[PDB]
Amino acid sequence: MGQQPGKVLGDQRRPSLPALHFIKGAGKRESSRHGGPHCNVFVEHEALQRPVASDFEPQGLSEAARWNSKENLLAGPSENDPNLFVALYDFVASGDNTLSITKGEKLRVLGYNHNGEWAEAQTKNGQGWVPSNYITPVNSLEKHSWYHGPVSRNAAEYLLSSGINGSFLVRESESSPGQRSISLRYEGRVYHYRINTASDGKLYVSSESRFNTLAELVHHHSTVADGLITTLHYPAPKRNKPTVYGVSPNYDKWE
Incomplete structure (x- = not known):
């Protein structure tokens, strides 16, 4: 035609x-x-x-x-x-x-x-x-449930409010980039451990065990109690689905 x-x-x-x-x-x-x-x-x-x-x-x-x-x-x-x-x-x-x-x-x-x-x-x-x-x-580390990124301690309490014995998460401070903590709830109490970032870029909670990646940190600390109250048992899931407002994503002309 x-x-x-x-x-x-x-x-x-x-x-x-x-x-x-x-x-x-x-x-x-x-x-x-x-x-x-x-x-x-x-x-x-x-x-x-x-x-x-x-x-x-x-x-x-x-x-x-x-x-x-x-x-x-x-x-x-x-x-x-x-x-x-x-x-x-x-x-x-x-x-x-x-x-x-x-x-x-x-x-x-x-x-x-x-x-x-x-x-x-x-x-x-x-x-x-x-x-x-x-x-x-x-x-990335973000793909894991435990890694929540920008989380205040009160938001971490909220995350572990329904957390079981051995529940955990890694938070980074939005107000202080690079500064991270493992919030581990065990026996009905939420504990907070410092992820110390070495000068070359290594991560470690414990001065004795320094890993190249936070992935190796969570692995080693989920296998053994290595400076935690217990092994990293249960990962706390994401809190908010971020609200997206009125966006046409790029598409006005897009093919």
Whole structure:
């Protein structure tokens, strides 16, 4: 059919249409085992960290029900591609031009917008823009539930208010970059340990055990009690899903 379509005009101005949409769309298991052999508590799954509650024995241990991502801790770079990202939160596409991401899914960022709030990204769900604050590279510490980043001590109390025996998190001070703490709740009390950053860039709570990465810090301190009251048992999850206001991500003209 020899008809001439209205394909594309050219360069235009930016209008103000606030695209907004929500729906309950999450549920993915990218799950495995790492272990960390020592004392038990009273819970059931795979991975030799804490032995099972002796009433039920479906697998014999317990870790993967609380933290399956413990093998992504010392995974290093991503599975094959060093620039692969992962979804921190399950996010619903606000518009058609944005993308619905599932929590814990490995997705690919292509590039951020003018102010770096949103990125053209691709999931198994399709294509579209997703925000920085709902994703992170698989190379980072942020991909782990325990790492919350900018958290005041009161917000860490709030995080560990519903925390069990051995619950933990790493916070960084928004008011003091580089200064970090491990808030570990055990026996119904929240304790706070200093992550001392050595001059060359090493991390350590304890002066005796200095690691290259905070990943090795959490590993070594989840296997053994190394200056903690107990082993890093349960990672405290994220507190807030960051509220994004009225954004067209980059797309006014975007192809």
